[PDB]
Write a protein that binds this ligand. Sequence first.
Ligand code: ATP
Ligand code: ATP
Ligand code: ATP
Ligand code: CTP
Ligand code: CTP
Ligand code: CTP
Ligand code: CTP
Lengths: 247, 247, 99, 247
Amino acid sequence: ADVAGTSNRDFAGREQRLFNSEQYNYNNSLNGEVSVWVYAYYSDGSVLVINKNSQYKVGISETFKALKEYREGQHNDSYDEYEVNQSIYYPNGGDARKFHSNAKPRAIQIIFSPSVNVRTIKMAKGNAVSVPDEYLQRSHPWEATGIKYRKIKRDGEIVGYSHYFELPHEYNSISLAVSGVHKNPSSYNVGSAHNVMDVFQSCDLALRFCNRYWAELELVNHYISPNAYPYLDINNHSYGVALSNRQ
Amino acid sequence: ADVAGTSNRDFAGREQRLFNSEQYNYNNSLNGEVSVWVYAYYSDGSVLVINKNSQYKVGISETFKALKEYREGQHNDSYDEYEVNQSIYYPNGGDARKFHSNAKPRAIQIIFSPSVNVRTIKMAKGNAVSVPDEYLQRSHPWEATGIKYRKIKRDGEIVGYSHYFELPHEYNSISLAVSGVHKNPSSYNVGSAHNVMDVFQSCDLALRFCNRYWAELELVNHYISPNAYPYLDINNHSYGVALSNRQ
Amino acid sequence: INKNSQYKVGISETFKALKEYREGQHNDSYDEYEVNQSIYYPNGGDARKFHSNAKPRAIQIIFSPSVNVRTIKMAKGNAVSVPDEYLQRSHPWEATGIK
Amino acid sequence: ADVAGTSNRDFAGREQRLFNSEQYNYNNSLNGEVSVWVYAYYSDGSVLVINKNSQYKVGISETFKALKEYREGQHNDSYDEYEVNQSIYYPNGGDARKFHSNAKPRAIQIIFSPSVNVRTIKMAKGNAVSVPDEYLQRSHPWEATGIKYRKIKRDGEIVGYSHYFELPHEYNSISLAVSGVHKNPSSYNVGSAHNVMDVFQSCDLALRFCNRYWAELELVNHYISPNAYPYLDINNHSYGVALSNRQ
Ligand SMILES: Nc1ncnc2c1ncn2[C@@H]1O[C@H](COP(=O)(O)OP(=O)(O)OP(=O)(O)O)[C@@H](O)[C@H]1O
Ligand SMILES: Nc1ncnc2c1ncn2[C@@H]1O[C@H](COP(=O)(O)OP(=O)(O)OP(=O)(O)O)[C@@H](O)[C@H]1O
Ligand SMILES: Nc1ncnc2c1ncn2[C@@H]1O[C@H](COP(=O)(O)OP(=O)(O)OP(=O)(O)O)[C@@H](O)[C@H]1O
Ligand SMILES: Nc1ccn([C@@H]2O[C@H](COP(=O)(O)OP(=O)(O)OP(=O)(O)O)[C@@H](O)[C@H]2O)c(=O)n1
Ligand SMILES: Nc1ccn([C@@H]2O[C@H](COP(=O)(O)OP(=O)(O)OP(=O)(O)O)[C@@H](O)[C@H]2O)c(=O)n1
Ligand SMILES: Nc1ccn([C@@H]2O[C@H](COP(=O)(O)OP(=O)(O)OP(=O)(O)O)[C@@H](O)[C@H]2O)c(=O)n1
Ligand SMILES: Nc1ccn([C@@H]2O[C@H](COP(=O)(O)OP(=O)(O)OP(=O)(O)O)[C@@H](O)[C@H]2O)c(=O)n1
């Protein structure tokens, strides 16, 4: 017969806090998801998002061509854009009718879920023919870029990790792959013989999503926010939901 | 104060040789790339290339449909070619307006980087419905075809490995997957528990490339040569760059 | 755009006229009408894009060395061709020669 | 320490009134704009507006063809409408598939800013081949129509001047030019030798605007009102902002 918010017998309050805490902790458990998003920003203000969600580890790999703006059900200068690709793969190799394709991304943001271990993040940012570092012979196949990731924070809680980089120059023509491993502070190796086949199955079970939104507003409103995803906008504003020990 | 090319004090010469040797050896190290290319040759003289570059191991897998010629931004007889597929998947199963689709590859060449171990190469050359050997029940899922690979050589150095096969007959309608493992003469298993999650990450981090060139000339000039890739042309001519102990 | 004349010379263009037009190619003409409506008044259009890549990213004005730079005048208006927010408070030009 | 709206020490009030008065008076000064709009009303309810804003004097001149409805990015019966023009320029001179083109304006409204001197307004309302009065040989090139202009009033202030005329008959096929001169109650002639080159420059510097709105509602809401322009609607309702000595 106690009054709300006045004693330790407010079970609605306690259960609300536990409900949120359990979600925070489940995601961070070995049973939980790790997620990555790649955002490609185009000059027309639209944004391509690619997302993958999987247990244990997760990544995305795209070609130069795949990262170019594609407007579903509209004209895309498809023939001229084939010629653009040829001239990007080798200088003067194409016969395009344009100096700069507005379909090329102007910037990339990579975001991981807070369940990633940031020291496991690896990126292969290749040239337009998918070579990590000038020539295959001298290429390490990735860079460990975790130190560059900024914490996306809401109410003091890390809700995600962001690496943002611009591609403002004519020569910024890239292929891109990124990968991170789910946190595991235990000494149980999820890829040790006991569980390695489950990790192989996780590669099959990973769910992917891709869509082009017309505006960052639409991305924030209809993609980030409804799904309780983390995001950092072009104005450096953080989005996400803090859950640990919170009502 | 020594004269160029006349003593052991030609440091420009020594460093040039070391620079090239280091690239050769880095590629062959466990830190290095292994690469595969699949070339599909069409009757119009164009060539589809698919390339993947990754640490540890690498492969490509394509469907029958995926290997058919696609001309970006041009007509492709898309409806008739759906009917072609139906008649290829089962005899008399389609209603195509042609006896032979000129979109079917006439030949395939598989090339691996010299950092592959040739004894690890495996190929699954399936029928048009993606069965390795007539029926699933009697199929081994691959053949180890390394003994068939020819050494692509420049100046006495192996710059790559090639398996070329023609598809000259109406019945040569294939699905195709190929895989090789990076050399590892050490007794350190890159997939042992210590490193297995890095191999899982390598699957995410692998970069892919695909493009159709109008001619083998254009492939040699604008794809093989600029990237210091190995190649064997239809005239049996070898392309590539020898690097070990060379200026 | 170039004009050559004796005594004095100038050029005057609308917002629409300065947008990229690709002769003999597709130009998203309908969507670009909607772009214009949304540029003339906020939320006034129904365009399928946030930013039209047809909008100029920069302008350079060049005069021949036979101009008197102290006579140069520019009317850089908004998208509805008003020099300075509202007609009632607009001087119809700025003397920009010092720049 | 006085209370708002209770003394001569309400400086916010005084400055608000001066701010508005200054805008009213600046526009009417020789440094200010004079503006003209031509509205062409089509049977589908859409309205073409042409506006020009310039110092000293201002006008608009359009051909018969230019005043016809054009729907950007939609079909316009362009070939048939060429034939319509031929049959309008000379009776039975075309081969059109229609008796009356719905692209012809049904009415015209000319509006000047209140900074015009109404006695300077001149109109050349020509026939479809751009002759003011039947034949060039007997044409005065304009009519001084200022006496016909109605004052558009808001709160007792003239906010603009309107001349409205319908074109309800099949034979109302017009070319149209209008011109007015900015008020100048001084004895300083803005076109006297001292300033004549500035008037020549004003011809270059005049800004033009044209757009077709789908409805008079849209014109009122999104063109007239946001820009503090004067307007008189088909219901004889006046729009505009009174500024002289007003808060
Ligand atoms: N890897 C992690 N994952 C999730 N939460 C963490 C992690 N590391 C620390 N935290 C918790 O998140 C909160 C924020 O810690 P953090 O160190 O990020 O804050 P800070 O020191 O103010 O900012 P910064 O470290 O970026 O300068 C702390 O309450 C901490 O306990
Ligand atoms: N697996 C390998 N990878 C890279 N280089 C190798 C490999 N095996 C041998 N080599 C080196 O490459 C060079 C060529 O050796 P190879 O045995 O291919 O020549 P060959 O005997 O003339 O030709 P083949 O063996 O094809 O008849 C030698 O100098 C050798 O040391
Ligand atoms: N040419 C003008 N430009 C701007 N304001 C004017 C002009 N002539 C008069 N006014 C002012 O505008 C207000 C309206 O004057 P106006 O003579 O138009 O009113 P009215 O006599 O009620 O109407 P009308 O003259 O149309 O019958 C007056 O306060 C007057 O001082
Ligand atoms: N560098 C070149 C050379 C030729 N063309 C020709 O011009 C036409 C333009 O078409 P395309 O580039 O395909 O643009 P759209 O057809 O407008 O767009 P989409 O194909 O995406 O519908 C093509 O058919 C092609 O034959 C071209 O666009 N660019
Ligand atoms: N076996 C058949 C049966 C019918 N058609 C019809 O003929 C048309 C030919 O078009 P398609 O095969 O699609 O070739 P294109 O339109 O020229 O090429 P693309 O679709 O690649 O632009 C099709 O619309 C289809 O309705 C056909 O091509 N083949
Ligand atoms: N905001 C909107 C609403 C509708 N549409 C419709 O989608 C089609 C796209 O055509 P358009 O914008 O005119 O582009 P293109 O036809 O490709 O280019 P152009 O007209 O310059 O040849 C139009 O017919 C129009 O009916 C559109 O583009 N944009
Ligand atoms: N008096 C005539 C004679 C012939 N045609 C023919 O019929 C077609 C109708 O097209 P048009 O009048 O141009 O109308 P749309 O093509 O529908 O509109 P737009 O051209 O503005 O897209 C034309 O190609 C023209 O050859 C016509 O319209 N009117």
